[PDB]
C-alpha cells in the first residue's frame, strides 16, 4: 500500500494559491463516486480490492457507484473502472449537526483489478502520530464545485486543534483534524477527499474532507475528519463482514 | 388535520428580528429529532399517527427517536412522547451535494396518540398553488444552534424562485422554495422542519427546512425542499409500506 507504481511530482506551486495538477495516476487510491446519473458528489480512497473509505456526510447509498482509475473527468479515451456498491456501512456515531465522526465505508459487489494506476493508500494506525507543521496533500477535483477537470494537488501544514479553533471555535470535536490556511486554499479536496502524508516511503490517510472556507480563502484551514481517531471501528467493519 | 385544539397567536413582532415565542401546544405537528442520547438535531412534522416527515440531509437512522408534544425543550414537567423509528424511508433521487430533493419519511414502530397538543398538518395536492408574497410562517428551536429554549414562530413572505436567484444564484432548483428577506430571519426552523401557511381553515405544509442564510441576515432568505413537487412521493410510499 501507500507506493504508486507512477511516483508524485510536486513542486513550489503546489503550495500557493490554488496547488497545481498532479501527475497523470500518480495517486492511484483515488476514486470518484457518482450517482446512477453518473454526477459526481463526492470522493473516497481505495483500502483494499473491495473496500473503499468516504465521509458520512456523502450520504452514499447502494444505486451509487464507485469510479476507479481516473485522471480527467472529461476524457472518455482513458482506462477506469465502474464498481457496483453491495452494503452501506455508516458510523452510527455521525451527527449531521455537528459533523463530527464523519466516516463511512462502502463495501464493493464484485472485487476491483489492482494495476499500475489502480492501488491502496496505507491506513494509519490508531496511535500514529501526525504532528502539528507536518507538510502533507489533498487531492480531488473539488475546485469543480465553482476550472480545470484534471486532478488537482495541494501542499499544505497540518495544524493543532487549539490553533484550529482561533478560526472556527467550538466547531472543532476531538476527532476532528485541520490543514492549511498558509497562503494555499483547501477547495481542491472533494468532500470525503483524501489527506495523506508520507512517512517511511509510504503515502499514509490522515484526513477525510468535511467542509473548508466558504469563500476558499487562502488563509482559512480546512477540516478534516481525524481517521487515527476511527481506523479502529474500520477494522471491526471489515473483519465483521 | 391542520386544525390546532389550540389556536396560535401570532403578533406583529413575528415579522420583525429573530420573531416570537409561540402559544405552547399551538403547532401540534411539530417534532423533534434527536440521537439516542438524546441530542436534538433536527425538526420534522406529523402527518398521521405513524408517519413523519422530515429533510433527507438530516441523514436519520432507525437509532434515531422522535418526540411529539414538547414545548420547552428544558422543561421536564410537560407531557411528551418519545417514539421509536421502524424504517426509514430517503427519497432516491436526493443528492448531498446539490441539496435537491431534500425529504426523508420515517415510520415509526408504534402510533402516536393524537390529543389536544399532538396532530397531524395538512398535505397539499401536488398541482396546489401558493403565491409569491403570501404570508407563511416557519416554527422551530433552530435559534438554539448560536437564547431561546422555548418553541418560536416567525411570519414571512414566499419568493419567487427567480427573485430568490438574485441571492443564491444557480443553487436555486425547481424542487426549492424560498421566503423571507423582509426583515426577519428564517433561522428559527430546525434543518427539517415546518413551513406552513393557512388556506380555507387548515394549515398546510409548503416547505421543509433545507438551508439558510450563514449570518441570519434579516436580508437573505431561507430555502426549502418544495412539498408540492413531493408529495406524490411520499403518498406512494405510505400506500407501499
Redesign the interface.
Known sequence: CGVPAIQPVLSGLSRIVNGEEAVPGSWPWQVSLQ?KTG?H??GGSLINENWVVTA????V?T?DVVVAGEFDQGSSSEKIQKLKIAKVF?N?K?????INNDITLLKLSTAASFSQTVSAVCLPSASDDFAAGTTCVTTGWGLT?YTPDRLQQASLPLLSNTNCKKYWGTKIKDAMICAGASGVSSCMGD?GGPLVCKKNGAWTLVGIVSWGS?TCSTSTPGVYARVTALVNWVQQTLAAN
Open positions: 450517482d454526477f458528489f463526492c458520512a456526510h456523502c450520504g447509498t444505486s455508516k452510527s455521525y451527527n449531521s449537526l455537528t464545485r468532500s466558504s
